[PDB]
């Protein structure tokens, strides 16, 4: 009775995500990188594969019902921390290009001035 | 695509968060077949976690997360030479 909605509901979410997994691991961790050239295009693919797996191993560990969840939780803020870094790096790439194009527009106006 | 499939991951993350929130042992008492269905729904998890085991192919698990994050690090250091030298 009480378990009867949630267990079929969550399994349907597994059923929802189950084709998404197979399209995610369609081509290999080498292949899906080796087809790509930009390391920025290589970047989050490493993360996102780990990003799901982190939640995946946090999910299945609940099914054993083990009272500990720390040594995957200890891995959790790690994966955040590396996701924290290159975004702030990629923020700085903007300011490299954001202001250099204003340098482009300014010096043309100087001869115009 | 990140924003699509992770939104579906988030969808199942919350559903994974929705799983053992209820008291689960009570119908494991009331039948094995609740537990066995919960075992069978874990057999999805025995398959769906294995998909990325297949991508490679607990103490097993403690190994490769290094080797996952191994390859994260050599990006930014190359990105350091790709950008800070640039």
């Amino acid at each position: 009775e009480k378990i009867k909605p949630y267990v079929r509901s969550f399994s349907k979410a597994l059923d929802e995500l189950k084709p998404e997994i197979e399209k995610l691991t369609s081509k290999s961790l080498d292949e899906q990188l080796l087809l790509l050239s930009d390391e920025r295009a290589k970047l989050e693919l490493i993360n996102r594969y780990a990003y799901v797996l982190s939640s995946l191993m946090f999910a299945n560990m609940k099914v054993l019902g083990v009272k500990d969840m720390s040594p995957i939780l200890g891995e959790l803020k790690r994966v955040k921390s590396y996701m924290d870094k290159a975004k702030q790096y990629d923020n700085r790439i903007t300011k490299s290009n954001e202001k250099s194009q204003a340098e482009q527009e300014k010096a043309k106006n100087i001869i115009s001035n | 695509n990140p924003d699509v499939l992770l939104s579906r991951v988030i969808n199942v993350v919350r559903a994974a968060s929705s799983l053992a929130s209820q008291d689960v042992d009570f119908y494991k008492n009331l039948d094995r077949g609740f537990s066995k269905d919960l075992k069978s729904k874990a057999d999805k998890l025995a398959d769906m976690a294995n998909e990325i085991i297949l991508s490679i192919d607990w103490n097993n698990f403690g190994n490769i997360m290094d080797n996952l994050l191994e390859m994260s690090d050599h990006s930014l250091d190359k990105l350091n030479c790709a950008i800070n030298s640039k």
Binding site: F58, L73 | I10, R14, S18, Q22
Partner: peptide, 14 residues
């Protein structure tokens, strides 16, 4: 709405 906060919420519990 940082994308690790879904690890942090307490679920809907009966």
């Amino acid at each position: 709405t940082d994308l690790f906060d879904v690890f942090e919420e307490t679920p809907v519990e009966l």
